[PDB]
Amino acid sequence: SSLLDLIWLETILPKTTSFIQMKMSIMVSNQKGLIKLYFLSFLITIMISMTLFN
Amino acid sequence: NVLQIVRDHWVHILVPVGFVFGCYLDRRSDEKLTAFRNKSLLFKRELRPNEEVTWK
Amino acid sequence: TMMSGRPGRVPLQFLPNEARSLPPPKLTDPRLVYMGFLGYCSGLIDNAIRRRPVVSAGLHRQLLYVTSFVFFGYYLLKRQDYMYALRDHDMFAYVKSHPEDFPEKDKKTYGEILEEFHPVR
Amino acid sequence: PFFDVQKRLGLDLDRWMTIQSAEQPHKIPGRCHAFEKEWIECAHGIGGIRAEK
Amino acid sequence: MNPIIYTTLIMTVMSGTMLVMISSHWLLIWIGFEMNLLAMIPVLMKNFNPRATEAATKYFLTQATASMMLMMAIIINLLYSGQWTITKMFNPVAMTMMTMALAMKLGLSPFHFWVPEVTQGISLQAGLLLLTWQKLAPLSVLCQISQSINPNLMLTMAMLSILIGGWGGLNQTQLRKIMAYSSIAHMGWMTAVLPYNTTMTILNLLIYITMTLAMFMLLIHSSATTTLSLSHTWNKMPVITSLMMVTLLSMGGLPPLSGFMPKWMIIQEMTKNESIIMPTLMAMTALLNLYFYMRLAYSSSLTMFPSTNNMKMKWQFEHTKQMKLLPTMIVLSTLVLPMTPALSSLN
Amino acid sequence: AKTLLHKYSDIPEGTECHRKAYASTSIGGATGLIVSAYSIALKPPASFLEGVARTGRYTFTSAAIGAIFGLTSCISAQVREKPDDPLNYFIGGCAGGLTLGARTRSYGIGAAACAYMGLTAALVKMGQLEGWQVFAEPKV
Amino acid sequence: PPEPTIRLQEDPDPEDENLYEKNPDSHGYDKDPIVDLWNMRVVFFFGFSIVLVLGSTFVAYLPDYRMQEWARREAERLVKYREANGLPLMESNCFDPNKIQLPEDED
Amino acid sequence: MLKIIIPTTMLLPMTWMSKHNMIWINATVHSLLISLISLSLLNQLGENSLNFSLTFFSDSLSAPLLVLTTWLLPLMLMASQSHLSKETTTRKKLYITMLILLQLFLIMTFTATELILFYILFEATLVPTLIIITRWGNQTERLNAGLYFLFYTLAGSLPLLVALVYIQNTTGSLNFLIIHYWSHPLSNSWSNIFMWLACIMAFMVKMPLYGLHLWLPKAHVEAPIAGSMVLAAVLLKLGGYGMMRITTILNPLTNYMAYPFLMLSMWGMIMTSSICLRQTDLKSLIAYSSVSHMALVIVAIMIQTPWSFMGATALMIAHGLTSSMLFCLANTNYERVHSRTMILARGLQTLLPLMATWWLVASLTNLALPPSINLIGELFIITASFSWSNITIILMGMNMMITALYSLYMLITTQRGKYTHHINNIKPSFTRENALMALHILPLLLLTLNPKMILGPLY
Amino acid sequence: WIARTFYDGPEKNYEKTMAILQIEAEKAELRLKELEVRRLMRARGDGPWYQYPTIDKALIDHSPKTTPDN
């Protein structure tokens, strides 16, 4: 009841998914609104696209 | 009282009318799957003197 | 199947002339009935959003919704049928003109084909 | 996407400015008029894939 | 602004898009994009406040950069083949520059950063126009030159867009940012099928536009831009919240709703090309969009939140302006799954 | 680009363990450098020297993970005398995952890394064997 | 602390109502006695009288479309023929071997 | 098949145009009539099937499930009448609309000659149940439960869809008839292994499998009574129906691929039966018992023998009826005590004797007392498992013993002993509740007279 | 009586199944054929489908061009 059903079977599928998605969301959405960083990322991805797909 | 309970008990008639309509629609959909009527190897039969189709 | 460049295609023509060679959809087509039902639901939701008696507020408005949905649905069904007819026409013509790519396979019966048997145990 | 209004109406809104071998003012030829003319005549109606190959 | 001026600006936006979609010359397509950009700014800045001005500035910067890259690709393609007609790209470098420019115009990842910013800055009507009408021209250009695109780059950006939309929408309490991230994810779904079938791209665009129109009109009707503000809507107009909940169910791709039609078809199309892994990841990632749609549905109609005393006054008044096309949009975005084969109309 | 892909794939699976380890280390270092560039572009942590320290840490961690994966998988393939089995890539993949856990110093992250990297490595091996295409070319 | 210790203006949770108080003979269907009685009557008539009895009788007398009696008669006549003619009852091969073309191995 | 579908659709306009005090009467009457109409699909053939049209067909696996689905709606209306009395007319009509929509989706799901149509309706059922749980549930956990109940399902169902469309690209059809007649062996390959997993996991998560069963106690404990009834009676059987339908194209790979699921089921039935022994909640206990029974059904389907399929059909029908009855009894207790804790209200046999008799009969049928159809299914599955391997008898016997133990424990805790002194609001049981229990239990004891009606197409 | 009033004979269901099976078999073989035809047209480009535009040769000007060599 407690060890497997309430803890580990809960930890494996649903809790891990929730934790992973929460961290990924917090990483992706947390941008300070500084377009300097946005366009620096734009330059990096432009050069990566030029050097990676041809 | 007629023409008063009709306005109050009219809803009851809908389930039975739906059933009759569904039966008619089932027959209508059946009518378009007659490509093999009296043509199967198992029940290939000679028509009766006053029979047109083996089933409907 | 990209038919955008198919030869002899008038640019902005909804229904070509050759589409008139096809049987029109019947007025009691189930898809037309569903389009009318969609118009009826739109009328009900229109009554509900405007805070009016949902079933019996505006009969002219609901009739107009049903009629417009049926009209557009009829023409849409015609165009749909025409496009599927073109697809089948092109496919059959291509198979006819390329016999070496669609060969006639040999007829084999199951009494002379060996299939592996897998017991369920 | 592309709505060929010009083809439907026969207008020529911008087709006059697409290729070198198409009716320049004062009959001035492009530097590669002959090559472009040959390539266009080769690939007409054949389609993109077959023209490419 | 003057209603005549507003009408003129809207018609100029529409004429720029139509010039993009009817022309066969790259210069005229560029001119249409320029006209659309030029007439779009005052529409975004219609309600004058510093937020809208900031949003208009960000939008102008991104779109002008995209236009410059588009012209650069046009000139390179002209250099390697003296062609002005929109057809083949004729150069690997010109095709990459062109795909980047159109992705920045659409808001595809990695060029997605401006969409939530601008959508949050502007009002609900400006956001409606921005997220519906402004996708028609870049997507039409992409549909025309799809046989040139490198499938690797387009599929990479589509998968990135789906992932980013899913993860970024999970963290939002503002409704406009939720709409922006939903738009990003739907753009990702649309561009993943361009290399294989442009008809599915157009079908996805039509379904997405219908759902977005219904959603924005519902948000304007119950004038809420925040999750908690939307939580108060049940105490005045519960039918609006119910319609919103069903629309959110449709937007999440749950069958038998209309939003299930594109993804299904797209997945179906991609399996005809022996592509199995990518559609699977796409669906599993769209589960995140469904999750935050469900959170909004919980907050809006499935549970009843506390209200305020002043709401009683609002009970005594009715909307002065009503939306003619909202019921049709709701019904179309909810109940058109039985009419799926009509996609052969090459919509 | 695809140069490192050819470099890694050209080597036979059960031979040249050092060359496989070198190719895997190169791929890991490149991936770590790209991730570091992304992080620096989106988030400037404190300064030039702290940022380059972060980039060095990320690159070294990624290169170590790649090295451990490559060497362990190649050794397993050579010793088991059964090449082209996803179990070897599973073992190597979460040897790499376990090393990631040791670098991060957490038992939970080590176990999760073993799970998820062994599964991913086995899936990649299966896809190579069966010809699964992540980016399918348009045929129809 | 000038707060009332009250988070919001809320209705008190009511006490559950007893149907037997205002109406003995309450049948537990509805608080209106007439609607209550008629709901009892329709449930009992359409659930026990119609479905439970007539449906059970209908299922009991369903015609033999699964062909159990037909199968037993076929087996009876087949056994009668095979016993008389000395044939070895059931055969091991379900299909006639003469209409099967086996592949030669020649190994 | 439209003679059943159209009246179910007409149930909606009849509900919404009913008087404020006539919704329950009309809905119950017409649902009972629809059940009587559907009862004529039990006339099945020893030949192929009842192929009505290109879209819908009937089978002796489909017909018992259809009859049970139709019969469940009137009982759900009777059970929901009580706790929805203080509710507005519009919201009562919306609840009845959800119930009718769920019935319509289930009826079309069970016939559904196409696998894509089956998938679409199989997932369409997910929406009304979610609304019912998250809207008319009492506790604060209902929302959480709904989330679980949703995502678990979709976690299994999106891969299936992919596999489904993939199959049609290779076979050319997803019609059950063409799929069955044109079936070809599935090679032992990695691609085929993952196709097998995609085909199976969607139905496996809905049974539920022992590893993936966490959503079920949450959803059942949190849902209202009608939601619990339909979840335990019909919605759990969608996985069994789907597995029986789809395992035809998975041979011979099922022989190897079934081992992990067989071990999970045979051990998890013991695990969940033992969990039932230490449970302080009636609804949670009944949910865990359902998990055990569905584990046995999973074993039956994976073994894939004629006796396995017959036992699986019989057990699915019997469990649906029994679990619905058990939930109804627990809900009758809850509507008096408002606690849902087993140890609180005790000695109820002294205060409610006829309801104690209903409790005894429900516990006896959950215990699989012969010649009930519960034991018919149990015994057929056990015999098939014994033929599969003689060592399964150990686990089956342990499961039987533990099942008897917790069934009689639940009976004794609630009905026997001394009444709780401070509980004085226990009223005599209503005619509605007694009739609800009778309408659950008499069909079971009637079905034991004609078992072939619920033994499926391999009878 | 039940068979006479509620049901029909076996031939009806038998031949309806035969017709349904024919329809589904032809649909399946048509689906396979259409997939193969689409693949062939997309690869070779000689069919009515996947026809991508090329420059219209009616735009070319055929006149003396102020220089003899075009």
Ligand SMILES: CCCCCCCCCCCCCCCCCC(=O)OC[C@H](COP(=O)([O-])OCC(O)COP(=O)([O-])OC[C@@H](COC(=O)CCCCCCCCCCCCCCCCC)OC(=O)CCCCCCCCCCCCCCCCC)OC(=O)CCCCCCCCCCCCCCCCC
């Ligand atoms: C499978 C396909 C087949 C089935 C099709 C199903 C869809 C069809 C209809 C589609 C939509 C059209 C109608 C919706 C408009 C809503 C109007 C409304 O509010 O109802 C009030 C209205 C009466 O109340 P009223 O006094 O006028 O005003 C009250 C206010 O409207 C407001 O009342 P209020 O303010 O007092 O109460 C507030 C309430 C009000 O909120 C609502 O009422 C919700 C409205 C539904 C949302 C519509 C979404 C768009 C369509 C989605 C369809 C989804 C289907 C897919 C499966 C997913 C399932 C969700 O909101 C709440 O309480 C919030 C909590 C709700 C819980 C969570 C929400 C779940 C809603 C999901 C419902 C889905 C089915 C709805 C069926 C129709 C319901 C009326 O109800 C009606 O009478 C309309 C019903 C239709 C009339 C039928 C007339 C025909 C009969 C005679 C002809 C016989 C036919 C055969 C001919 C031959 C015979 C001889």
Ligand SMILES: CCCCCCCCCCCCCCCCC[C@@H](O)O[C@H](CO[C@H](O)CCCCCCCCCCCCCCC)COP(=O)(O)OCC[N+](C)(C)C
């Ligand atoms: C999303 C739900 C549907 C909403 C759609 C809007 C409904 C209102 C529209 C009213 C009618 C519009 C038709 C316009 C009249 C004539 C149009 C004609 O001149 O154009 C033809 C084009 O016709 C239209 O494309 C077909 C429109 C039909 C759209 C409906 C299909 C939606 C999919 C099915 C979902 C169910 C919806 C049904 C309920 C509305 C020829 O175009 P062509 O120059 O040769 O090729 C360019 C386009 N290409 C490149 C993609 C090939």
Ligand SMILES: CCCCCCCCCCCCCCCCC[C@@H](O)O[C@H](CO[C@H](O)CCCCCCCCCCCCCCC)COP(=O)(O)OCC[N+](C)(C)C
């Ligand atoms: C209080 C104590 C009782 C007082 C009364 C005393 C009398 C008691 C006697 C009754 C019980 C004793 C058992 C004796 C059985 C006799 C009847 C039996 O022989 O008939 C059975 C028939 O019973 C039915 O087959 C089973 C009942 C049908 C069940 C349908 C349920 C009702 C529908 C409601 C919906 C429920 C949904 C459930 C999902 C599936 C078997 O008949 P069968 O040998 O074969 O052939 C019939 C005749 N033929 C040859 C002409 C064909």
Ligand SMILES: CCCCCCCCCCCCCCCCC[C@@H](O)O[C@H](CO[C@H](O)CCCCCCCCCCCCCCC)COP(=O)(O)OCC[N+](C)(C)C
């Ligand atoms: C002693 C008696 C033993 C037998 C008991 C019989 C019990 C009969 C009631 C049970 C019926 C079972 C359900 C049957 C539903 C389907 C029947 C349907 O197929 O028949 C249709 C007709 O349906 C019937 O009219 C339905 C009767 C419904 C009523 C049943 C009896 C109970 C009614 C209770 C009403 C109470 C009202 C309130 C009273 C106060 C017409 O079929 P059709 O598609 O053409 O068939 C083609 C083949 N043909 C041409 C040879 C026929």
Ligand SMILES: CCCCCCCCCCCCCCCCC[C@@H](O)O[C@H](CO[C@H](O)CCCCCCCCCCCCCCC)COP(=O)(O)OCC[N+](C)(C)C
């Ligand atoms: C969590 C709650 C329950 C959820 C459901 C659980 C059920 C899913 C279990 C999956 C069934 C088994 C998967 C594959 C079975 C095939 C047999 C194979 O695995 O064993 C050996 C295979 O050897 C190794 O096992 C290779 C695979 C090793 C990599 C797999 C990771 C091992 C542990 C991971 C478990 C995690 C499962 C959950 C993932 C999220 C056989 O040797 P070999 O003759 O060579 O292969 C024959 C098969 N061929 C011909 C197709 C090649």
